[PDB]
Amino acid sequence: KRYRALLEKVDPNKIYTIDEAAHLVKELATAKFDETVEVHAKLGIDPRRSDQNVRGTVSLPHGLGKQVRVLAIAKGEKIKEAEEAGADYVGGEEIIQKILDGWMDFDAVVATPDVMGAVGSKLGRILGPRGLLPNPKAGTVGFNIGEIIREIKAGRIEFRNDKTGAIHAPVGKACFPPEKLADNIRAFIRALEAHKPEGAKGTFLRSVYVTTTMGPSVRINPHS
Numbered sequence: 001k002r003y004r005a006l007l008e009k010v011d012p013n014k015i016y017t018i019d020e021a022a023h024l025v026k027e028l029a030t031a032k033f034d035e036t037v038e039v040h041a042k043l044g045i046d047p048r049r050s051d052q053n054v055r056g057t058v059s060l061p062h063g064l065g066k067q068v069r070v071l072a073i074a075k076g077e078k079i080k081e082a083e084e085a086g087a088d089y090v091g092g093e094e095i096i097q098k099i100l101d102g103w104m105d106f107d108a109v110v111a112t113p114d115v116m117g118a119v120g121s122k123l124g125r126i127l128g129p130r131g132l133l134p135n136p137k138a139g140t141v142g143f144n145i146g147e148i149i150r151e152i153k154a155g156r157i158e159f160r161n162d163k164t165g166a167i168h169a170p171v172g173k174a175c176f177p178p179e180k181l182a183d184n185i186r187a188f189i190r191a192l193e194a195h196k197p198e199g200a201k202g203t204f205l206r207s208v209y210v211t212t213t214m215g216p217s218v219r220i221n222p223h224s
């Protein structure tokens with residue numbers, strides 16, 4: 001038990017406006033560190049149909065682009081590729097000890113498939129909860145590491161539905177000022193609607209939610 005007080009602040013049968021949720025969500029993220037805020041949606045698509053799949057990018061108005069300090073962990077000539085692409089910090093596995101000793105001045109981590117065993121094994125504990133672990137479908141692990149770095153630097157994050165017909169993406173951290181959070185949430189919804197597939201029939205956004213790492217979900221009105 002660590003949530004009776006957390007359950008009293010949210011009405012489960014209420015559809016909140018994006019601004020109310022933006023303010024409310026900050027009070028649900030009363031946990032350690034800076035909690036990642038995500039928007040989740042149930043889409044009106046047939047997930048087994050390739051012509052009804054949703055994949056795209058959203059340029060969020062706050063938090064991304066240049067200002068993001070990217071740490072790239074790689075091996076061989078991939079370190080050179082990462083340097084050429086402009087990652088803020090680049091290192092081989094030797095840099096894991098630096099993070100272990102308390103170094104943490106980066107906002108995002110990208111890595112090549114070959115350093116992941118050691119990365120996930122030595123840092124899954126620290127980075128995992130903070131939402132900083134490179135992950136194949138978060139698009140932060142791949143051999144085309146120069147491309148990954150340039151995308152984030154450009155301020156774009158990718159999204160795609162999963163096999164259950166759900167989709168989601170991080171839109172900020174709990175500490176963000178509510179108006180910035182609200183701006184980012186609206187930006188993701190606008191991007192998502194512009195990606196409604198041709199033949200999708202019926203309601204596209206069946207229900208939309210805002211949530212933190214390990215908190216209750218808040219249902220929101222996508223058109224507020």
Ligand SMILES: [Hg+2]
Pocket residue numbers: 168
């Ligand atoms: Hg996720």
